[PDB]
Amino acid sequence: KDLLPNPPKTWEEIPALDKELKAKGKSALMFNLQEPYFTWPLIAADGGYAFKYENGKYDIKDVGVDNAGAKAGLTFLVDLIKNKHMNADTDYSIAEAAFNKGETAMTINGPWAWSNIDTSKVNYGVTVLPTFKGQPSKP
Amino acid sequence: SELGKELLEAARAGQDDEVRILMARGAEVNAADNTGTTPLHLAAYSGHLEIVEVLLKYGAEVNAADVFGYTPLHLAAYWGHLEIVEVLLKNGADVNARDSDGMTPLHLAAKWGHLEIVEVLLRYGADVEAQDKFGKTPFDLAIDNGNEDIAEVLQALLAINRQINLELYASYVYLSMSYYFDRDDVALKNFAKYFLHQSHEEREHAEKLMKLQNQRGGAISLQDIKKPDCDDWESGLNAMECALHLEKNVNQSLLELHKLATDCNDPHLCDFIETHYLNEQVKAIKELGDHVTNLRKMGAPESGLAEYLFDKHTLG
Amino acid sequence: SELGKELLEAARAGQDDEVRILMARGAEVNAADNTGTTPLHLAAYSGHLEIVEVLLKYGAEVNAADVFGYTPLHLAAYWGHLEIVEVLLKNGADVNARDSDGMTPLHLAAKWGHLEIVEVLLRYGADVEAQDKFGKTPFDLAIDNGNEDIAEVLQALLAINRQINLELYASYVYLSMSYYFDRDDVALKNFAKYFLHQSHEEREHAEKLMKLQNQRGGAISLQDIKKPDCDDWESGLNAMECALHLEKNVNQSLLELHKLATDCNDPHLCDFIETHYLNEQVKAIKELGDHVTNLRKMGAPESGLAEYLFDKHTLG
Amino acid sequence: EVLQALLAINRQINLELYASYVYLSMSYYFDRDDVALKNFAKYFLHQSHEEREHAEKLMKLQNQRGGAISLQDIKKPDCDDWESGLNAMECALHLEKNVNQSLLELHKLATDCNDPHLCDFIETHYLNEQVKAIKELGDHVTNLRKMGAPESGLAEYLFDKHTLG
C-alpha cells in the first residue's frame, strides 16, 4: 500500500508504471515464471482455455492453446520480458523474498503465502488481478 | 566469462568502482548470456553513463543484437536516457536498426514521447518513412499516442524534403524540353533557350529550400529524381501546355506546405514561402497562359508559320 | 464486310484503282478476318504505299494487333519497306510495340539487317534496351546475325546516353557534399563553396554531351538520377577522398568511350572526347590528390585546427 | 486585448534595451589588458548598436499606432567577468534564443487580437534577423570548440584573426 496507494485495473498499465519504479530503485512485478500455473491468468484471459469444459465433461480433442487470445497474452508476456520489465530466470522464492523486503511492489499469489507476508509487517493489501483488453484474468 | 557475470551484476546494479576494479583485472566486456544480453545492454537499461563509457573504452560491441533484435540504442530510446543515446550514436551505433518487429529506435521514441531523443536521432539520419510489421511509421505511432509536437516535427520535415525533390524534378523536365527543341527536325532556337532558362531557375529554387533547411537545423534527405514523362514533345503549343500543368502542380504543393506551416505555428516558414515562392508561381502561370493563348490564336500547331513567328517575336 | 474481302483481295494484289472504286462505294476499312489480318496488314506486307496512304486517309487502324501480336509496323520492318515504315510512324504507330515474343520492330530490323529502318525507328524513340522472351536486345540479334554496323550504332548510342546520366549523377553528389558543409555543426564555408562550384561544372559537362548528341543526329534518352550514397559525410578529408574516387570512376568510363569510338572509326568523337574531357579529368585528379595529401599531413581529421586552417588558406 | 498588447510591446522594448547593455559589457571585457582580443570587442560593440536600433524601431511603431510608450529600469548584466571567447559566444546564443522566444509569443498574441499589421511588422523586421543571428552564433560556437578552445590560447587568437578579422 505504501509503494502504490492506488492499484491499476489494466495489465496495459503495468509497463508504464514500471518505468516509475526503476526511478526509485524498485521493480513493478516479480513472480514465478517457471510455472504455467502463474502465467495462465494472463495468457488465457482473452480466448485461451485448457480443455473445452461443458455440461460436466472435458473434451479431450479440444485443447485450446492455438487461439488468438493465447497469442495476445504470450505476446504481452514477451513485451514485458523483452524491454526488461521483469526477468526470465526468476521464480517464486526470489519474488516472495523481495516482496517481503518490499523491493517489488506487485505480486500474484494464493492463500499459502499470506502469513509469510504477515511476517514482513508491510502494510499490504489484496485485490483482484487487472483485466486485459477488457477480458479479465482467469486463474 | 570468469568475471563476465561479475560484470553483469555491476551492470544491473551500477557500481563504477566494481567495473573499475574488474577492468584493473581485465574482465571481458563481451559477456553474452543465453539470450544475448551484454553488460552494455544492462548498462543502457539502467541509465548510468559511466559504466557505458568505460565499456566502450574497453571495446564493447555497440551493435550487439539480442534474440529479440534489440540493441543498447533500442533500450536507451525506450527508457528515455538522452546522454547514453548521444554517446552510443557517437560510437557508431546504427540509427536505423530494426528489431524483430521492424521497429527502429525512432519508432520507440515517438511512441513514448521523448522529444530530445527524437531530435538527436533525426540529426544522425533516422529514417522518417520506416514501417514496422503493421505498416506504421513513427508519425503514426506519435498520433496514436497523443504526442502531437513529435508528429508536427515529423510531418514538416517530410513535407520540406518532398518539396526539394519536386523542385529538382521540374528542372529535369525543362532540360528535356529544351534539348527537344534543338533537334535538327525541330529547329526552334528560342524555345530551347527559354526552357534552359527555366531549368536553371528551378535548380535555384531547390537550392534555396536546401539552404533554409540548413538554417533551421533540420535534416536534408535526398531521393531519386525520376525521368520526365516524354522524350518527344510534339510542338511548341503542347510543350507550353505541359509546362503550365507542371507549374500549377508545384503551386498546389506549395499551398499545402503553407497550410501545414500555419497549423504548426511557424511564422518564419510562412513568410519564407510567401516571400520567395508564392508570387513567382503566380507570375509564371500568368506568363505561360499568355503564351498558350497567343499560340492558339495564331493558328498553331497546324500552322508552321505560327510557331516560327512566335519564336522570332515573343521569345526573341 | 460486304466489300471487306473485296478490300482484302486488292490488298493482297495491289490495285490502286480497285481500292479507289471501293472508297467511291464506301468500303469499310476495318475488315478483320478470323485471325485479325486487316487490309492495312496486307497493304504493309505487300509494299505498295498508295493503298496504305488511302487506307490511312479513310481512317484505318494503325495499331491493330493480330492473334500473334504483329502490327503493320512489325510486318513493314520485317520485309524492309522504308516508306511505309515512315508513314506509319507519321500516323501514330507505336514504335515500342511488342509481339507474342516481346520482339519490337527494332528487334526485327536489327535481326534482318535494314539500316535505314533502324535509323528511322531510333529517331522516333525506339527502346535500345528492350528484351524479348530469351532476354535478347536488338544489339544481341545484330551481333548474332553478323550485322556489325547496326551493332556499332546501337552500342555507341547506349554508351553516350550512359555517360550523360553519369555526368548528371556526379553533379548531385557534389550538391549533397556542398550542403553538408554548411550545417551549423559543420561550419566550413569554403568547403561548401568549393563543392557547389564542382556541382555546376558537372552540369555543364552533361549539357555539352547533350549538345554533341544533337549535332550528330542521335537520340537523347534520359533516365532516373539516383541519390548519393551518403547524406552524412564525416570530415573534409573523407569528402575529398570520396570526390577523388568519383572523378577516377568518371575518367575510366570516358576512356572506355574513347576506345569504343576508335573501334567504330569515328575521329570526330575521339577528338571531342580528348579535347573537352580527358585533360580536365587529369587536372581534377591532380588537384584532389593534392588536397588529400595536404590535409593528411596537417593532421586531419583528428585535428580540428587542420581543417579550419585548410579552409582559410587553400580554399579561401 | 488592448491592455495585454500594450504591456507586451512595452516589455519587448525593455528586453531589447537590456540586450544592448549585455553586449556593451561583453565588448568592454574583451579589451582589458589581460584579455587582449580586439576583434571580439569590435564584434560585440556592433551587436550592442544593432540592438539599440531594434528597440528604437519598436518605439517608432508604438508611436505610429497611437499607443503609450512606458519605460522601465534597465537591469545590469549577469556578469562583469566573462571567461573566454567561447563562453561569451555561448551566452550570446542563449540571449538571442530568449529574445526570439518572446517575439514568437508576441506574434501569437497579435494573431489572437486580429492585428495583421503587427504580425507583418514582426515577421518582416524581426523574425528573420533572429534566425540569421542564431545560425551565425552557433557557427562560431562549433568552430571555436573544434579548434580546441578555451584550453587552447592559440585557438582564440587565430579565430580572432581569421573569422572576426
PDB file of C-alpha atoms in Angstrom, chain A residues 2-131:
ATOM      1  CA  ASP A   2       2.936   2.355   0.578  1.00  0.00           C
ATOM      2  CA  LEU A   3       4.700   1.914  -2.768  1.00  0.00           C
ATOM      3  CA  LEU A   4       1.373   2.174  -4.583  1.00  0.00           C
ATOM      4  CA  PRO A   5      -1.698   3.727  -2.912  1.00  0.00           C
ATOM      5  CA  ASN A   6      -3.929   3.154  -5.970  1.00  0.00           C
ATOM      6  CA  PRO A   7      -3.714  -0.200  -7.774  1.00  0.00           C
ATOM      7  CA  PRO A   8      -4.232  -0.345 -11.548  1.00  0.00           C
ATOM      8  CA  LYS A   9      -7.024  -2.260 -13.246  1.00  0.00           C
ATOM      9  CA  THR A  10      -5.325  -2.899 -16.610  1.00  0.00           C
ATOM     10  CA  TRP A  11      -2.295  -5.006 -17.477  1.00  0.00           C
ATOM     11  CA  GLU A  12      -1.535  -2.433 -20.180  1.00  0.00           C
ATOM     12  CA  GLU A  13      -0.796  -0.022 -17.319  1.00  0.00           C
ATOM     13  CA  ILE A  14       1.897  -2.298 -15.812  1.00  0.00           C
ATOM     14  CA  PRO A  15       4.756  -1.461 -18.265  1.00  0.00           C
ATOM     15  CA  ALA A  16       4.378   2.317 -17.920  1.00  0.00           C
ATOM     16  CA  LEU A  17       4.261   2.273 -14.112  1.00  0.00           C
ATOM     17  CA  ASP A  18       7.321   0.007 -14.157  1.00  0.00           C
ATOM     18  CA  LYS A  19       9.166   2.975 -15.675  1.00  0.00           C
ATOM     19  CA  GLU A  20       8.355   4.781 -12.436  1.00  0.00           C
ATOM     20  CA  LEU A  21       9.712   2.126 -10.093  1.00  0.00           C
ATOM     21  CA  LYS A  22      13.136   1.863 -11.731  1.00  0.00           C
ATOM     22  CA  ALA A  23      13.315   5.588 -10.920  1.00  0.00           C
ATOM     23  CA  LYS A  24      13.047   4.622  -7.227  1.00  0.00           C
ATOM     24  CA  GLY A  25      15.206   1.501  -7.434  1.00  0.00           C
ATOM     25  CA  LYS A  26      12.124  -0.731  -7.315  1.00  0.00           C
ATOM     26  CA  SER A  27      10.508  -3.316  -9.577  1.00  0.00           C
ATOM     27  CA  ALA A  28       6.863  -3.433 -10.610  1.00  0.00           C
ATOM     28  CA  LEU A  29       6.022  -7.139 -10.824  1.00  0.00           C
ATOM     29  CA  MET A  30       8.071 -10.204  -9.883  1.00  0.00           C
ATOM     30  CA  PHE A  31       6.600 -13.703  -9.656  1.00  0.00           C
ATOM     31  CA  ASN A  32       7.256 -17.328 -10.595  1.00  0.00           C
ATOM     32  CA  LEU A  33       7.667 -17.568 -14.370  1.00  0.00           C
ATOM     33  CA  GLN A  34       8.730 -21.230 -14.176  1.00  0.00           C
ATOM     34  CA  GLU A  35       5.132 -22.476 -13.916  1.00  0.00           C
ATOM     35  CA  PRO A  36       2.096 -22.226 -16.210  1.00  0.00           C
ATOM     36  CA  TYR A  37       0.017 -22.067 -13.008  1.00  0.00           C
ATOM     37  CA  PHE A  38       1.091 -18.447 -12.522  1.00  0.00           C
ATOM     38  CA  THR A  39       1.009 -17.349 -16.169  1.00  0.00           C
ATOM     39  CA  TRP A  40      -2.358 -18.857 -17.183  1.00  0.00           C
ATOM     40  CA  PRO A  41      -4.495 -15.925 -15.869  1.00  0.00           C
ATOM     41  CA  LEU A  42      -2.948 -13.512 -18.378  1.00  0.00           C
ATOM     42  CA  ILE A  43      -2.470 -15.689 -21.465  1.00  0.00           C
ATOM     43  CA  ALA A  44      -5.880 -17.397 -21.265  1.00  0.00           C
ATOM     44  CA  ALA A  45      -7.862 -14.287 -20.309  1.00  0.00           C
ATOM     45  CA  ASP A  46      -8.955 -13.254 -23.814  1.00  0.00           C
ATOM     46  CA  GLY A  47      -9.512 -16.583 -25.564  1.00  0.00           C
ATOM     47  CA  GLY A  48      -7.299 -19.279 -24.086  1.00  0.00           C
ATOM     48  CA  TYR A  49      -8.672 -22.281 -22.210  1.00  0.00           C
ATOM     49  CA  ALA A  50      -7.004 -25.554 -21.217  1.00  0.00           C
ATOM     50  CA  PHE A  51      -9.730 -28.023 -22.251  1.00  0.00           C
ATOM     51  CA  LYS A  52     -13.231 -27.333 -23.515  1.00  0.00           C
ATOM     52  CA  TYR A  53     -15.459 -27.984 -20.498  1.00  0.00           C
ATOM     53  CA  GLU A  54     -19.244 -28.132 -20.910  1.00  0.00           C
ATOM     54  CA  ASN A  55     -22.075 -29.977 -19.105  1.00  0.00           C
ATOM     55  CA  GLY A  56     -19.606 -31.519 -16.663  1.00  0.00           C
ATOM     56  CA  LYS A  57     -17.448 -33.039 -19.427  1.00  0.00           C
ATOM     57  CA  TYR A  58     -13.905 -32.139 -20.507  1.00  0.00           C
ATOM     58  CA  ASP A  59     -13.321 -32.523 -24.245  1.00  0.00           C
ATOM     59  CA  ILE A  60     -10.001 -34.223 -24.952  1.00  0.00           C
ATOM     60  CA  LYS A  61      -9.748 -33.186 -28.631  1.00  0.00           C
ATOM     61  CA  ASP A  62     -10.339 -29.546 -27.648  1.00  0.00           C
ATOM     62  CA  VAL A  63      -7.091 -28.413 -26.002  1.00  0.00           C
ATOM     63  CA  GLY A  64      -7.233 -24.664 -26.560  1.00  0.00           C
ATOM     64  CA  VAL A  65      -3.825 -23.051 -26.971  1.00  0.00           C
ATOM     65  CA  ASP A  66      -3.901 -22.231 -30.713  1.00  0.00           C
ATOM     66  CA  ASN A  67      -6.184 -19.248 -30.135  1.00  0.00           C
ATOM     67  CA  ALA A  68      -5.776 -15.532 -30.774  1.00  0.00           C
ATOM     68  CA  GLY A  69      -6.215 -14.811 -27.069  1.00  0.00           C
ATOM     69  CA  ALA A  70      -3.328 -17.083 -26.108  1.00  0.00           C
ATOM     70  CA  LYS A  71      -1.284 -15.369 -28.826  1.00  0.00           C
ATOM     71  CA  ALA A  72      -2.128 -11.938 -27.400  1.00  0.00           C
ATOM     72  CA  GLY A  73      -1.280 -12.979 -23.848  1.00  0.00           C
ATOM     73  CA  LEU A  74       2.040 -14.539 -24.792  1.00  0.00           C
ATOM     74  CA  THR A  75       2.985 -11.509 -26.895  1.00  0.00           C
ATOM     75  CA  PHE A  76       2.208  -9.330 -23.875  1.00  0.00           C
ATOM     76  CA  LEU A  77       4.490 -11.608 -21.858  1.00  0.00           C
ATOM     77  CA  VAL A  78       7.296 -11.211 -24.391  1.00  0.00           C
ATOM     78  CA  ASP A  79       6.768  -7.445 -24.327  1.00  0.00           C
ATOM     79  CA  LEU A  80       7.099  -7.482 -20.546  1.00  0.00           C
ATOM     80  CA  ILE A  81      10.261  -9.571 -20.803  1.00  0.00           C
ATOM     81  CA  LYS A  82      11.890  -8.017 -23.896  1.00  0.00           C
ATOM     82  CA  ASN A  83      12.032  -4.464 -22.527  1.00  0.00           C
ATOM     83  CA  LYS A  84      13.304  -5.965 -19.235  1.00  0.00           C
ATOM     84  CA  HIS A  85      10.372  -5.093 -17.005  1.00  0.00           C
ATOM     85  CA  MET A  86      10.916  -8.474 -15.327  1.00  0.00           C
ATOM     86  CA  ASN A  87      13.495 -11.255 -15.531  1.00  0.00           C
ATOM     87  CA  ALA A  88      13.050 -14.619 -17.216  1.00  0.00           C
ATOM     88  CA  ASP A  89      15.050 -16.739 -14.754  1.00  0.00           C
ATOM     89  CA  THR A  90      13.012 -15.505 -11.789  1.00  0.00           C
ATOM     90  CA  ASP A  91      10.826 -17.851  -9.769  1.00  0.00           C
ATOM     91  CA  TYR A  92       8.743 -17.979  -6.604  1.00  0.00           C
ATOM     92  CA  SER A  93      11.471 -17.726  -3.949  1.00  0.00           C
ATOM     93  CA  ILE A  94      13.212 -14.557  -5.161  1.00  0.00           C
ATOM     94  CA  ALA A  95       9.813 -12.979  -5.853  1.00  0.00           C
ATOM     95  CA  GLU A  96       8.302 -13.626  -2.430  1.00  0.00           C
ATOM     96  CA  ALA A  97      11.547 -12.808  -0.597  1.00  0.00           C
ATOM     97  CA  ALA A  98      11.895  -9.489  -2.428  1.00  0.00           C
ATOM     98  CA  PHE A  99       8.248  -8.650  -1.752  1.00  0.00           C
ATOM     99  CA  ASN A 100       8.765  -9.425   1.944  1.00  0.00           C
ATOM    100  CA  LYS A 101      11.601  -6.891   1.843  1.00  0.00           C
ATOM    101  CA  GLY A 102       9.355  -4.545  -0.133  1.00  0.00           C
ATOM    102  CA  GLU A 103      11.507  -4.242  -3.255  1.00  0.00           C
ATOM    103  CA  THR A 104       8.930  -5.378  -5.815  1.00  0.00           C
ATOM    104  CA  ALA A 105       5.527  -3.787  -5.269  1.00  0.00           C
ATOM    105  CA  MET A 106       3.163  -6.207  -7.048  1.00  0.00           C
ATOM    106  CA  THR A 107       2.893  -9.962  -6.809  1.00  0.00           C
ATOM    107  CA  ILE A 108       0.379 -12.686  -7.629  1.00  0.00           C
ATOM    108  CA  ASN A 109      -0.218 -15.389  -5.050  1.00  0.00           C
ATOM    109  CA  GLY A 110      -2.789 -17.666  -3.482  1.00  0.00           C
ATOM    110  CA  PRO A 111      -3.517 -18.037   0.227  1.00  0.00           C
ATOM    111  CA  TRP A 112      -0.480 -20.092   1.232  1.00  0.00           C
ATOM    112  CA  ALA A 113       1.925 -17.130   1.342  1.00  0.00           C
ATOM    113  CA  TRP A 114      -0.385 -14.667   3.139  1.00  0.00           C
ATOM    114  CA  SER A 115       1.020 -15.367   6.606  1.00  0.00           C
ATOM    115  CA  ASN A 116       4.525 -15.085   5.142  1.00  0.00           C
ATOM    116  CA  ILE A 117       3.724 -11.518   4.120  1.00  0.00           C
ATOM    117  CA  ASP A 118       2.334 -11.115   7.636  1.00  0.00           C
ATOM    118  CA  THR A 119       5.885 -11.834   8.781  1.00  0.00           C
ATOM    119  CA  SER A 120       7.059  -8.814   6.777  1.00  0.00           C
ATOM    120  CA  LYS A 121       4.723  -6.400   8.649  1.00  0.00           C
ATOM    121  CA  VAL A 122       4.490  -4.464   5.378  1.00  0.00           C
ATOM    122  CA  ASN A 123       1.252  -2.508   5.138  1.00  0.00           C
ATOM    123  CA  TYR A 124      -0.155  -4.528   2.246  1.00  0.00           C
ATOM    124  CA  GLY A 125      -3.485  -5.120   0.570  1.00  0.00           C
ATOM    125  CA  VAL A 126      -5.029  -7.814  -1.608  1.00  0.00           C
ATOM    126  CA  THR A 127      -7.193  -7.183  -4.661  1.00  0.00           C
ATOM    127  CA  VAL A 128      -8.341  -8.709  -7.930  1.00  0.00           C
ATOM    128  CA  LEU A 129      -5.914  -9.057 -10.810  1.00  0.00           C
ATOM    129  CA  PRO A 130      -6.214  -6.371 -13.509  1.00  0.00           C
ATOM    130  CA  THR A 131      -8.265  -7.054 -16.607  1.00  0.00           C
TER     131      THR A 131
END
